[PDB]
From Swiss-Prot, chains A, B:
Domain MOSC positions: 15-179
PANTHER family for the chain: METAL-SULFUR CLUSTER BIOSYNTHESIS PROTEINS YUAD-RELATED, MOSC DOMAIN-CONTAINING PROTEIN
GO molecular function: catalytic activity; molybdenum ion binding; pyridoxal phosphate binding
Primary gene name: yuaD
Natural source organism: Bacillus subtilis (strain 168)
Name of protein: Putative metal-sulfur cluster biosynthesis proteins YuaD
Pfam families, A to Z: MOSC
Alphabetized Gene3D superfamilies for the sequence: PK beta-barrel domain-like
Length: 182, 182
């Protein structure tokens, strides 16, 4: 029920301010709760549109600690939107991987392990919202309705979110071991 | 993306000793990490046969904070095993529900919410192991090879495991609101 495959962490990024657009780093520390100093770090978070069964603002466990996208799927989004490129930073990703053209399909329960031993527990698909779409729009202001275009074309290829299962440091270019749940 | 369903918490149980076998409680407190005082309580746990991508004993995040089974699937296990009954306690369950068919199939990402607001985040199917099988065998000494029969017949209907998404108290008989993912 565990099929193993090797992939690569092409880029690492952190949201060190209130902005969700991340900035590239040569290294990141993964600890329980996520990336220390990152916008989504912590044991808890406030409920929002992603957790509609809770009243907005309700304090709940922070399930979306780390955001991952694959270079292949980002290129796929770019093509579908008719734009030259889509940067992981614009989507607020913390890790951009290569060698995973179907990353979004990685089932919950799967693990992604780094050379240091740091490990991520897959918490499923990251549903596309309008915000990143509006960010993409700002980079191509001469192209109409890109925000809604993102929400439409990114569905199923916008990446996944994970919880930190084991602490450890991660570095740019790290070869990763994916344990795909079956 | 979410389907609402209603179920009922028929029983609540805690493992207050070193044994995973639980005992009925009229009330339980859910907090991040599970049930305070319970054998499986904690933000972390030690890796075992269930998390083979880690060496045994490795400290990792505890995604198996609360275990749930349904009265209906326990009856199903009993039928397939040829025994009068299978108690949630013997499987080390913390919550026994009724009113929701195929509990084990509840998708990861689903939410189970109690009247007090206490909420559980589904972390998937609970794989059956030999231990509860040995407990069952001890209650039916006249029955042969029940331990192995349990692992065999309980597969796919042994319940689920969850993490606590929102703290709160839960009581026997509580009506629960289930948000089924997909
Ligand atoms: Cl409330
Ligand atoms: Cl989004
Ligand atoms: Cl088991």
């Amino acid at each position: 029920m565990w099929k193993r495959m090797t992939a690569k962490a092409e880029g690492l990024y952190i949201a060190d301010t209130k902005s969700f657009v991340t900035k590239q780093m040569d290294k990141l520390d993964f600890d329980y709760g996520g990336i220390p100093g990152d916008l989504h770090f912590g044991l808890t978070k406030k409920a929002g549109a992603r957790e509609p069964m809770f009243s907005r603002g309700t304090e709940i466990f922070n399930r979306r600690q780390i955001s991952i996208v694959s270079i292949e799927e980002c290129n796929e989004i770019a093509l579908k939107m008719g734009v030259p490129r889509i940067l992981p930073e614009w989507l607020g990703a913390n890790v951009a991987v290569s060698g995973m053209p179907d990353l979004t399909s990685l089932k919950e329960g799967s693990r992604i392990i780094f050379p240091s031993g740091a490990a991520l527990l897959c918490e499923g698909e990251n549903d596309p919202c309008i915000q990143p779409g509006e960010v993409i729009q700002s980079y191509y202001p001469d192209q109409p309705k890109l925000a809604s275009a993102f929400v439409r074309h990114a569905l199923g290829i916008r990446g996944i979110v994970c919880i930190v299962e084991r602490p450890g440091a991660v570095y740019t270019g790290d070869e990763i071991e994916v344990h795909s749940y079956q």
